[PDB]
Design a protein around this nucleic acid. Sequence first.
RNA 1: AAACUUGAGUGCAGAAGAGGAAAGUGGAAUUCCAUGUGUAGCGGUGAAAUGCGCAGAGAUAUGGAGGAACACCAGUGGCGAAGGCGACUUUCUGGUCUGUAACUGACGCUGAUGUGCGAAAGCGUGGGGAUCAAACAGGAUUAGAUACCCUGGUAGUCCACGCCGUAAACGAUGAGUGCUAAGUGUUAGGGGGCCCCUUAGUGCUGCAGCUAACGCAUUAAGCACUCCGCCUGGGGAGUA
RNA 2: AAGGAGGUAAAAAUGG
Lengths: 131, 86, 273, 93, 63
Amino acid sequence: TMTDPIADMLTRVRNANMVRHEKLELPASNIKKEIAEILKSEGFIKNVEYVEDDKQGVLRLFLKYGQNDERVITGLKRISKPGLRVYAKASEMPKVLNGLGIALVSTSEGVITDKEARKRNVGGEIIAYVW
Amino acid sequence: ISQERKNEIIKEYRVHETDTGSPEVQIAVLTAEINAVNEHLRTHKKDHHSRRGLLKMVGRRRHLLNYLRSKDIQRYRELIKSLGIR
Amino acid sequence: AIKKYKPITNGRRNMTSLDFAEITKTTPEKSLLKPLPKKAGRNNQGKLTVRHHGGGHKRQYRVIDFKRNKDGINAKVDSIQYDPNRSANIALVVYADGEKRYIIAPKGLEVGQIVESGAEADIKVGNALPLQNIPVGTVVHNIELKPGKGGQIARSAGASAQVLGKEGKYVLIRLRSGEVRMILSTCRATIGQVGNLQHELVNVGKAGRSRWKGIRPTVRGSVMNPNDHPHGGGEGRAPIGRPSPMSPWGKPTLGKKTRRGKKSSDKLIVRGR
Amino acid sequence: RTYEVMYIVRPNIEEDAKKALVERFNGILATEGAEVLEAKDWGKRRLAYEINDFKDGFYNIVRVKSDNNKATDEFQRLAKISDDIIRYMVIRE
Amino acid sequence: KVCYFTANGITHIDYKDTELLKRFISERGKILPRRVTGTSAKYQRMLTTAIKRSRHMALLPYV
RNA sequence: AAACUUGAGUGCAGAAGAGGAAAGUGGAAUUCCAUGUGUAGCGGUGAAAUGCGCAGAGAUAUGGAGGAACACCAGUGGCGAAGGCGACUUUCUGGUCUGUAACUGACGCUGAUGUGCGAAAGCGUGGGGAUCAAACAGGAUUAGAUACCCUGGUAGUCCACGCCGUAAACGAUGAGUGCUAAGUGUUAGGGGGCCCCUUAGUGCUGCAGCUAACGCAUUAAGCACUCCGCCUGGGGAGUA
RNA sequence: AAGGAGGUAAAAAUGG
Ligand SMILES: [Mg+2]
Ligand SMILES: [Mg+2]
Ligand SMILES: [Mg+2]
Ligand SMILES: [Mg+2]
Ligand SMILES: [Mg+2]
Ligand SMILES: [Mg+2]
Ligand SMILES: [Mg+2]
Ligand SMILES: [Mg+2]
Ligand SMILES: [Mg+2]
């Protein structure tokens, strides 16, 4: 059965990005919503909408394509997994694509990006890479 | 078992009126079905296909019983002593 | 049905026996008993004319109703019982008028069941009827050869015959041996197969048990002397050393037919075994 | 549980003997707590093929309802034993 | 095309309806195939069972 | 620790099915047996011969005995975990699919070790024995022919109960879950007006993507997560 | 009109 909702969300985003879809509806969760908000803030997606319906609600993402129809998201990778969970220190925080990508992290201070983790000098569970 | 006997069993073991999905109801019905299939197999020993469904029912009842024992020990003990399935 | 002994001894090794689950009463009906002293294969001259008989357990005779001539009165199977005088078991049946009799116990006969005889009897195991009134294809036992004499054919444990067809005055039957022959349609038979089907499977397993059964030892011809047996004599072991194996009395005894000619039944016997 | 029983009586049957046979077998089908809803006769009909060297047969239809099948089993046993009924079949519904 | 049973609305086939079974039986007695008779599979199964019942009861011929 | 109903089960209303076990009934055909008619062939092959037949064969007509399999339907159709399941009838019994939204409230997935089923052949005991047919005999072919072909023919092929536990047991593709263009059949349903929508199967064609290529492609061999099993050059060897 | 799936006949000397 379902075992990694974050993985599933990233894979939905990847499949939609490949097919060049415009919108994307998935079941919602707090962690998914924070991830989507981080993506919007960083500029990888256009918009995020939350539908507060029954059955945990829905997250409606709107993807972002640049000029010439170029894809803003090159790839999304799940790092920490149910079968093997990955954590990193503040001084060991990885740079995705030499800084041209983000590593979404989960920290005592909320789920943030690797840049914010390094700035506040904290570590945590490396949820995903996006570039 | 007949739908009449199933209705009788669910009435007997239902936690409240209109309750059909309680673990008690499910495992009592499963016990009745298991006993009926056992009685069938006693005569038709070589009915492996039926016995497979019997084993599926046994496993489902075991999982229901495990969940009930984890959630409420007293109810589990009462139900097992009521059904004589220990 | 068959019980296999554990090999606690070399005598018991491989021995088997009936379990006797069929039997429902272990003692016989006193009034149906007669004394049966042993002949040990010796005739009225006191001479041994049949070898290998002698000794064995004492036995009482059970009077058995092979005739089944008590018609139109139901009989209730009082019990199944062991009978030392035959391979089959015997059923004590009690007629509605109170008369008690033994019959051969057919396979499947149960205590409490009802049996009857006569032309109007139903075709069910234990009922006895004339072959006239028995349908073609039915399996029967305890078949008469002369009307009113009593059953003589198909009375061993597991025995049966099959009705095949109805000529004018005769019915064709196939006997257990495979022979197909005619029998006077006025002769009676009992529906079903004789019970105790596992009888033949028993492994006697030791010599003493044959002795209990009254079988004395068979000495082979080849280990006698010439004055004893045609196979006797010779230095060391010898092969048969003549055209045919011989009986102790000097007759060929492998393949040589001995059914006598010009017998009345030769025109009734349709197909040999 | 309903049951339709169809059977065929031999064509060389006398009128009174056939009446007795039909009545006996209807009673048999009625015995074991089975209620004969309705029995009828379709007359003597040509058989699509010879059965026991008979080109015709008296067709009897019966409908009987019961909670078991002891009556049907007894009917089939006595029809197998009988030399007057050629064919028989029992349909549940 | 259309199915005879589906059009007529009949939802049951009686094995004693020899006149109806003769429609779908061949000249030699064989059961005509579904692709020829136009019937649906659901009712083709019922028809086959009824025809075999009738054959057994001698209402219809084998050959 | 406390809540939720989406997963998972349950209730209610419906559907199809060669799913399984046990009894009973039936038509065709083969073989054998008996009898009538009948004459010198039959059978077989590339061609032949063996063989059967002058004792009357083969053919033909009637009847009987017995075993095994179920012609048409029949279909990229159906059911089942797999093996497998195809005449009909009755009894017992398993699973699956559709709609509804009372009902329980995460009770789920996978699954080492274990425990069962498991084509055919094969083994034991007891039956049965038509057909076919390892072994085997004869004929033919051949340089030879322990074969292919022909004439026979035993085990076996069938049944009950035990045993064995293996197959190219294959989709050569582990199970569960979600996501990613389309077109068109067919099986069993459901909803809205011959049409549209929809669920679960079963087929074909075909994007993106994948692939060494062939090809797969909503029944993935694409994109992901969980768990299990398995691989690490060819022989030696599935051997010691 | 051209390709994919299932069933199903009839034929056959031997060696290159
Ligand atoms: Mg002797
Ligand atoms: Mg000596
Ligand atoms: Mg001498
Ligand atoms: Mg010597
Ligand atoms: Mg000698
Ligand atoms: Mg086998
Ligand atoms: Mg051969
Ligand atoms: Mg494999
Ligand atoms: Mg589909």
